[PDB]
Amino acid sequence: KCNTATCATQRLANFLVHSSNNFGAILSSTNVGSNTY
Numbered sequence: 001k002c003n004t005a006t007c008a009t010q011r012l013a014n015f016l017v018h019s020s021n022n023f024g025a026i027l028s029s030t031n032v033g034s035n036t037y
Helices: 007-027
Strands: none
Touching: none
16 A cells, blocks of 8 residues: 555546546547448
């Protein structure tokens, strides 16, 4: 354990870059075909 706000933000940060980025990654797979995907 680091210090919570430390080790926690470090894990919390793991979902920060994933939970927020993964979105542009899905929106990035819809009109990718435009036609009937």
